[PDB]
Amino acid sequence: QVQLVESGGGSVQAGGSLRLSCAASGFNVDDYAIGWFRQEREGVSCIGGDGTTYYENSVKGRFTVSSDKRDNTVYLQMNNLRPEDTAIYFCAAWGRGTHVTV
Amino acid sequence: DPLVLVFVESLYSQLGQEVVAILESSRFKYRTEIAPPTLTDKGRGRFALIIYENILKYVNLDAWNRELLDKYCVAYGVGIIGFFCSINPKSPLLYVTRPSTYEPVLLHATVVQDLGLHDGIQRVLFGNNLNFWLHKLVFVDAVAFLTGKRLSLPLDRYILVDIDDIFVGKEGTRMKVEDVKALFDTQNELRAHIPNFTFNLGYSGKFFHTGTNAEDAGDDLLLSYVKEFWWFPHMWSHMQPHLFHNQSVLAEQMALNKKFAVEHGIPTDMGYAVAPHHSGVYPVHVQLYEAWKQVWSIRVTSTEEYPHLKPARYRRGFIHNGIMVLPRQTCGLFTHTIFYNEYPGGSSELDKIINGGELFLTVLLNPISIFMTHLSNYGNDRLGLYTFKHLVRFLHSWTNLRLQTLPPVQLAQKYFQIFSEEKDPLWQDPCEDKRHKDIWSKEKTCDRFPKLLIIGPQKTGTTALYLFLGMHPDLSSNYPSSETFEEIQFFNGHNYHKGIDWYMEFFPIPSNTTSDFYFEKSANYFDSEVAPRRAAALLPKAKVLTILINPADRAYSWYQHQRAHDDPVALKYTFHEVITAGSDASSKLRALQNRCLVPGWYATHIERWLSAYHANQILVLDGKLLRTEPAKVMDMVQKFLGVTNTIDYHKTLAFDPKKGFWCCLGKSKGRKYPEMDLDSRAFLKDYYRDHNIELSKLLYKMGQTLPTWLREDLQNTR
Ligand SMILES: Nc1ncnc2c1ncn2[C@@H]1O[C@H](COP(=O)(O)O)[C@@H](OP(=O)(O)O)[C@H]1O
Ligand SMILES: [Ca+2]
């Protein structure tokens, strides 16, 4: 069974940081794309199985997506948070979704 | 003529098979020949493109033939292709390919192009073999510019992305919410590249609610998503149509899918359909085609097994029962593909099809494309989304072809306006291919095919040899027709467009009858061009039999044959002006001359019926031997046939004085008539001279029985 559980939320409303953790239960996180989607749904990041990294232009100097094979969890080390970033962030191979307030 | 002359090393060469495979898939007219012929026939354009599989055959050929082809290439302007990375944009053959003393093409380059200064002719030399997709991509343009746009492919590509087996998964192998939404978004985002590009879906309604709660939620989302999507008919329970030998059960299956179609707002105005594993389509089942037009009005369909499954570059299309059948080429996506790693062949096997496999061959050598994929490649891992997206990205990244995914009706119409000779079908034997035997219904038998062929011509003794071979205990005849009677008129006329089962109706069942040997006397097969190729395609082991008499006597016999058949052209016009008629004549007199003097040229018709069969299968017989002592001629036809129990025909047959032949036989084969005119005989001997000396060296060339009439009329000339 493929399941994707995400967590992490809230920030300094003038600008702060977060590390959203998307845990891949039941399958391997290094075999799938695990691209992050913010609400329609917009794919601001992606983290490939060899570790390649793609961003949109709004997030390109700010966000840092990452992966860890050991806890089988893809992390989104966010930085310098604009007020436009507030959304439901979906890690999709979809997941339940978690809310950021900034 | 745009006949492509190919110099292959052997018939089993791999590069030669690839070159001729590209040639028949793009319908380039070819003729196979081993590399060492007649370069021009009576000072005309026999060839227009000269393809060499080996460059050493073009360089190290005979000096007389080399200077002769140089004279032919300078005087007529033909193309020379010789087989031993981006594309150059400043090239005159960039009508298909799109860039992502001699001039380069694939920039030196593996595919070069010379303007012509040393030999004064345009030529293209392939440094690499035919394995990479780019080589084939520029090979089409090389063939087109080396022939002066006479062997081309149109710019308007017509791609039909078809998706079979919708709602066929049992549990866990279906679609969900995210993949369905990504499928609709994939159709709309890629609609800017290609006008009205969609994903034609093959729905099944029995396996619709067998999935889980997550699988059912994604399938119910497609019902309100039917506004901008194309869907094609399939059947309810997803079973092959050869098991359904009745119209009721198969029509009820598609009627249940029609209920499924009108129930969920699915459009039925498309006219396309697919059966699972392509059952009952080749061999043509009347039940499947009639059920298609009866309950769904399907006029466009597809097939993956014409004239055999292996390979796919030999795939054709045909128009049967008003249904324009097209060739179907899968992209490797079958129903056993669940995940990315559950694909048959690994993850690199699907990428092989994307980066230059069957996908690119189907959209490049054929202007019309049909593809095969199912719901299981769109669910758990989205195989077809990535595959078709990268495919269509490859098409706009490598082709100038203005491609539009339009409805299948005009897509099939364009397939038949481009391919004019592919309008007619070409039937084969279903028992030679075990896959075709499994695809065809098991209700019918397998040995209803005859083993002897009587090509004719008429008025030479074919009815006598037909009726005298029916009294043999190990030889059996066919059922007589209503209009043609002993003739079946299948291979030479329009009866060939009726199906393989149409020909089996005339022959008896091998289980009910004790004798399995069959034959038919269709004597109008001699004066035909399409008949030997069709006869060799359906029956490659059926031996032929032809009888020849004097062409003056046969022409006068045809003249009085038309006189007994109430033809007014033979009744009014005298035979002497028919043999001397020219261009300034009536249409009826020209038609009578075309049916009276044309089929007396036995050399051209034996050349037609000889190029499609083995020389041992042919047996030419003299007619005067059948008139004087036919029993010895029946002894040679028994040794030619190889029967089990040979009977004595000297005891059974006897001389008949009122018939004039040894026999019993009809009045139409023993008509009494007076002789000709001396001037008519002189002009008939001078008219049939070249045909008689050509027939003399032609019959002596085959090493068979030399005729007595040929020896009698040959001594007057030589
Ligand atoms: N043994 C034979 N029995 C009957 N006809 C024969 C024969 N050998 C040759 N023939 C010729 O076969 C012709 C008829 O051939 P077919 O069966 O194709 O109609 C006849 O032409 P004619 O009867 O006009 O003189 C006859 O000359
Ligand atoms: Ca199927």
Author numbering:
A (entry chain D): 1 to 39, 44 to 97, 117 to 125
B (entry chain A): 82 to 117, 123 to 170, 198 to 213, 234 to 240, 263 to 818, 828 to 882
Text lifted from the article:
Bifunctional N-deacetylase-N-sulfotransferase (NDST) enzymes are the first to act on nascent heparosan after its polymerization, converting GlcNAc sugars to GlcNS, via deacetylated glucosamine (GlcN) intermediates. NDST1 is a Golgi lumen resident type-II transmembrane protein, which contains a single pass N-terminal helix that anchors the catalytic luminal portions of the enzyme to the Golgi membrane. We have carried out a detailed structural and functional characterization of NDST1, the dominant human NDST isoform, revealing a 3-domain architecture consisting of a non-catalytic NTD, in addition to catalytic deacetylase and sulfotransferase domains. A distinctive feature of the NDST1 protein architecture is the opposing orientation of its catalytic deacetylase and sulfotransferase domains, which effectively precludes a simple substrate transfer mechanism for bifunctionality.
Unexpectedly, we also observed an approximately 2-fold enhancement of NDST1 activity upon nAb13 binding, indicative of allosteric modulation that enhances catalytic turnover. The NDST1-nAb13 volume was reconstructed following the same local refinement strategy as NDST1-nAb7, owing to a similar hinging movement. Consistent with its weaker binding, density for the nAb13 portion of the reconstructed map appeared disordered, and could only be modeled by rigid-body fitting of an all Cα nAb chain, derived from the nAb7 structure. nAb13 binds toward the side of the deacetylase domain, in a region that does not obstruct the substrate cleft. The rigid-body fitted nAb13 chain was found to lie within 6 Å of NDST1 residues K331, E333, K336 and R537, indicating these amino acids may be involved in binding. As with nAb7, the nAb13 complex displayed a more closed NDST1 conformation, as well as improved ordering of the D319–V332, C486–G512 and T528–L538 loops. No overlap was observed between the nAb7 and nAb13 binding sites, suggesting their inability to mutually bind NDST1 arises from allosteric effects. We hypothesized that enhancement of NDST1 activity by nAb13 may be caused by ordering of the D319–V332, C486–G512 and T528–L538 loops, which together form one face of the deacetylase cleft, and likely contact HS during catalytic processing. Accordingly, Michaelis-Menten kinetics for NDST1-nAb13 with respect to K5 showed ~86% increased kcat compared to NDST1 alone (0.26 min−1 vs 0.14 min−1), indicating improved turnover efficiency. As with full length NDST1, nanomolar K5 affinities were measured for both NDST1-nAb7 and NDST1-nAb13, thereby ruling out the NDST1 deacetylase cleft as a site of initial substrate binding.
